[PDB]
Subunit: 278 residues, 3 copies
C-alpha cells in the first residue's frame, strides 16, 4: 500500500515508482497511458525531460511499441541531441536464455555512470525494452539516486565521503571526487565507480578504504535510494545519468531479453570534467 | 455528465473537450481562465505547445481578446516560428449572414490537412475567433484525431488502410500513404484527403475504393474520433495539424463570423514528405 | 484560511502565495520541497520559467542552499541567459542591523521596474536570500501585479491611465505609456515609475496629475494586486520583471539580511522600448 499524489495536465496516469516487492524509493515515477492504444511519442519530449530531471527515473509502461531501432532512433533525434557512437544511435542488448558469460565475464555489474571515460558525458539513458518474454530470476537493471544516498549518510560517513576521491582505469583514465556537484544544476550528487588494482581512493588514509566502500554501499543500496527494474515488453525507461548511478543485479539463470539503449546529450553537450587529458 | 481528471500547476481550469451535445471524443482539452480578466498571453506558450502535442486540440475559452491581427501576429511570433504566406501571418476568414457561395462553391469541406501542396508543412493551426455574434446552424469547423480513428478500425479495415495510398491534385501534386507515421514523434497517424477525377487511391484493387472510403469515414467521423466546434467570440484554438485532419460541417444558412488563422512551423520547419518534386 | 488548488507532476508542494497576515493576492505561487533535503536545482528551470511567466512571482521556500555566489551564478547560467553587469552576474545586497542610510538616502523604495534606463530589459529577477537571521520590522521587498491593478481600476480611472505617459530621468532618460502591452506576450500591463522635478506625466492636464497618482497607487497597493515579502534564509524568489513592479516597504529599524540578485534576459534579449536614444 501507498498514497498517490500526482495528477498531470497531460493525458497520462502518474504514480510513484515502486519495485516488484512494493518498495518505494525516494525518486522515480511511473507513467501509464491515458488513452487506449497510446504511443510514447504522443507525449511531449520537453515535458518528459523535465520529469526525468526532477524524478531522475521515468518508467513509461503499457504504451505502444517503437516498431524497430530506426523508429526509436528517429524519436530520439526529436527528443534531444543523440550522442552518437561508432555503431550509431542504438546499442543492442540482447540476451539468450541461460547463455554463459564465456566462463570469464562477471555475472553482475557494480554501480557506475555512463561516459566516465568519454570526451563528453550524456545526460540521459533511453532504454526501450523490445522484448522480455519470460519472468527471470535476478539480473534486474539497478539504479541509485545519489542525492537520496546523501540524505542517509551520518556526520562521519559524510565527512569521510567529502575528503574522498576516485581514480579509475580500464588505456583511459578518469578521476572524480566522491561528493560532486551536479554539472549543470549545482545540487549535491555522488560520482562513484564501485569495485567488484584498477580502482584507487585518494584524500583518505588507505586503512579507511574499507569504511568508505562499506558506507557508500550501505547508502546507495538502501531501499530509500535504490531501485531494481524488472523489464517488461515495451517499457520505455528514461534515466538521469548525471544524478543516478546504475548497474545490474546478480543472476544465476539469465532469461531472454532484448533491450535498446540510446544516449542523449546534455544541453549543450557536456564536456567530461573527470577525464584525464594530461 | 462526465468526470474531470485534470489539475494544472498553471493558473487555469482544465477539463475534457466536449461538443455542444455533450459528446466527449478521445482527444482535445478545454482551458479556461484561473483569474478574472486573464488574457491568453499570460499562459506560457511552451506549455501550450506541449498540451497541443498530446491532446492535439486546445480550446482556450473565456480569455480576454487580442485587440487586432497585428497583436495576434506578435503573440504568434513569440509562440513559435510563424509560417509566413504572401499575405503575412494572419489569414482573415470573414463570413456574412446568408452570403451565397457565388452559386458554384461547395457548402462543406471534407477532411484534410494543411500544407499538403506546400514546400513545408506547419505543425499547428492557431485560430482566433474575432467575433461569432449569432448562433448559427451547421457550419462548425470539424477536427478528427487520426490515432482515435485507428483504434476503431477492425482487422480487415486496417489491413486495407495499410496497403492504401492517396494521390492528390488541385498544378500541384501530392502523394501520401493513408497510414503514416507522425513525421517527428513516430506514432501511427492517418494522412488522408477526403473526396466530396483529382483523387486516386493506389495499392488496392479499384473495386475496393468504395470500401476504403466508407471505412475511413466511419472511423474518422465516429464520436470517439471526431469533434465539431461551435465558435464563440474570443475562442483561441490551437490544433495539431500533424495528427488531426480538419474540415467543415455542411451549412444551410451561414451566420456572421470572423476568424483569423496563423500557422506555426514544426521545430525545425518540416519539409513536406509528400509533395511531388519530380 | 484558504483553499488549495494545485497538484504538480513535479516533486513539489504547490500552494497560493500568501503574505504573513494571511492575505492572498491575485498572483504568486509558493513552492516547497517534495523530498527531504531537496535542492532548488533538482527542479527543471524550463518548468520554473513557465510558472514564473503565468504566476509572475515564485517563492521557493525550504529548499537547500546555494553554497555561495559562484554556485548561484552557475545555476543561473543553466536557467537562461544571465544579463551581465560590470560586477558580473550577482548583485550583493547586504544590510546590517540598524545601519543608517548615511543621513541622506531615503528609507523606502517606490514601485518601478528593472532596466528602465538600460539598453536591454531583463525578464526575470532571481533573488537568493543568503541569510535573514532576525525577524525585522518593515523593510519587506514589495511586488505588484499590474494586470491585477488593471482589474481594479474603474471606467474613468482607466480612461485617465490610457491617456497618460511617464517621463523619467536619473544622464539617462526613459519614457513609457502608463498602460502598456507585455513586450512579448501582448497582454495588458502597467509601466509606471512611482515618485516618492525628475518625474513628469504627459497626455493629461497637469491638474489631473494628483488623480493619476492617487488612482495608480490605490490599485497597485491594493491587497488583490500587492504582495510584501518577509525574507527567510534560503528563500529563492523568481520575479516576472515584465509584468510586475517592485519596490520596498518603509523601515524604522532595519535588520540583518543578505540577498543576492541575478537578472535573466528575455528570450531572446529584450531591447528597451522606452530608452531615449535621440
Ligand atoms: Na509542465
Amino acid at each position: 500500500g501507498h498514497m498517490n499524489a500526482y495528477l498531470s495536465d497531460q493525458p497520462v496516469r502518474l504514480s510513484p515508482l515502486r519495485d516488484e516487492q512494493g518498495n518505494q524509493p525516494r525518486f522515480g515515477l511511473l507513467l501509464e497511458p491515458g488513452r487506449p492504444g497510446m504511443h510514447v511519442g504522443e507525449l511531449p519530449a520537453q515535458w518528459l525531460k523535465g520529469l526525468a530531471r526532477s524524478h531522475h527515473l521515468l518508467l513509461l509502461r503499457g504504451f505502444a511499441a517503437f516498431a524497430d531501432a530506426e523508429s526509436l532512433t528517429r524519436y530520439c533525434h526529436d527528443f534531444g541531441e543523440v550522442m552518437l557512437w561508432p555503431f550509431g544511435a542504438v546499442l543492442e542488448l540482447v540476451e539468450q536464455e541461460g547463455a554463459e558469460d564465456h566462463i570469464f565475464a562477471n555475472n553482475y555489474v557494480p554501480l557506475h555512470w555512463d561516459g566516465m571515460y568519454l570526451e563528453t558525458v550524456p545526460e540521459f539513458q533511453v532504454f526501450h525494452c523490445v522484448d522480455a518474454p519470460g519472468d527471470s530470476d535476478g539480473g534486474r537493471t539497478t539504479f541509485s539516486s545519489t542525492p537520496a544516498a546523501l540524505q542517509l549518510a551520518d556526520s562521519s560517513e559524510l565527512e569521510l565521503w567529502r575528503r574522498a576521491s576516485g581514480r579509475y582505469q580500464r588505456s583511459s583514465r578518469s578521476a572524480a571526487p566522491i561528493v560532486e556537484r551536479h554539472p549543470r544544476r549545482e545540487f549535491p550528487i555522488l560520482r562513484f565507480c564501485e569495485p567488484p588494482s584498477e580502482f584507487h581512493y585518494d584524500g583518505i588514509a588507505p586503512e579507511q578504504r574499507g569504511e568508505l566502500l562499506a558506507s557508500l554501499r550501505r547508502c546507495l543500496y538502501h531501499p530509500q535510494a535504490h531501485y531494481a527494474h524488472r523489464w517488461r515488453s515495451d517499457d520505455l525507461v528514461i534515466a538521469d545519468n548525471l544524478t543516478l548511478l546504475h548497474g545490474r543485479e546478480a543472476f544465476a539463470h539469465r532469461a531472454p531479453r532484448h533491450l535498446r539503449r540510446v544516449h542523449i546529450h546534455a544541453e549543450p553537450a557536456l564536456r567530461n570534467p573527470h577525464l584525464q587529458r594530461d
